[PDB]
């Protein structure tokens, strides 16, 4: 198991922990704020996913300071993990291309 693949895996597992923790913390953060809609766990988990992927449809989003803070972590964990998968694929291509060049 090469490093880039161990990191990709680690990244995926971690991102999933951030999606769950984040969903739990968003709801906890948003309740108490009138008009808040990021207030039930199931859709909160869905919200976290569309936030981690950066899609952000606009159906759900935090309105509180702490909920938005939770959001930032989720966004960054999402952008960073996927990016780390991109970098792991680049490594795979570079090394195979090396072998192919007989370097």
């Amino acid at each position, epitope marked *: 198991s090469a490093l880039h693949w161990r990191a990709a895996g680690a990244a995926t597992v971690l991102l999933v922990i951030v999606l769950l923790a984040g969903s739990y913390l968003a709801v906890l953060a*948003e*309740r*108490g704020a*009138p008009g808040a809609q990021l*207030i*039930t*766990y199931p859709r909160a988990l869905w919200w976290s996913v569309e936030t981690a992927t950066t899609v952000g449809y606009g159906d759900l989003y935090p309105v509180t300071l702490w909920g938005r803070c939770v959001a930032v972590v989720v966004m960054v964990a999402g952008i960073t993990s996927f990016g780390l998968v991109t970098a792991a694929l680049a490594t795979w291509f570079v090394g195979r291309e090396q072998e192919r060049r007989g370097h």
Partner: antibody
Amino acid sequence: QVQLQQPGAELVKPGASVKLSCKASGYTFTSDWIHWVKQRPGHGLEWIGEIIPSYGRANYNEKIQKKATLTADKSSSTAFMQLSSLTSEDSAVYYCARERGDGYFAVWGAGTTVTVSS
Amino acid sequence: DILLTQSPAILSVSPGERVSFSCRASQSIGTDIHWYQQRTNGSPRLLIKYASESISGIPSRFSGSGSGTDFTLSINSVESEDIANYYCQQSNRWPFTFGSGTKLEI
């Protein structure tokens, strides 16, 4: 079987305060929220507030004067709602319900009848 | 905060007839409306969740519909056990709110 247990009644002298209990059973999830609903005789349901025992955080209906204070004892699976300095206006049946974090009240207690008089 | 309006406070129906309870939301709330039944001296009982999702242990006689601002709780072929106060409640925006309620009269 009976999931939420509330004592039948509580008498309270005007101005005094009381703490109602709500012992829970059945499944318990860290995602559970315990709610308190006030129902005056001949009136509908009124939401007082909520609490996430697995964290201790509570929120209150900001549309009504805050006469309550929610707390929970994670070990005794007991949620308590403290009503402070009551008046005849506070006399009513107070139910507690368990919400799995999905928006609806799956189960309710029998409710405690609170009466404020000397 | 979302206001829920329950059309007529009382509904008169003949035995076995079909009855529909209306619950209007002051704004668009998807299908995040839940119905409760409460008989005299009783605690509220969940009848329908998320506007139309049935709850086991509840007669198939009960069904709900609607989305957005208008929701309906229906009882197909009403019977005496059904005499009670029916409430709708929303979980779309905090804080959760209840409708004033509608009494079923046979």
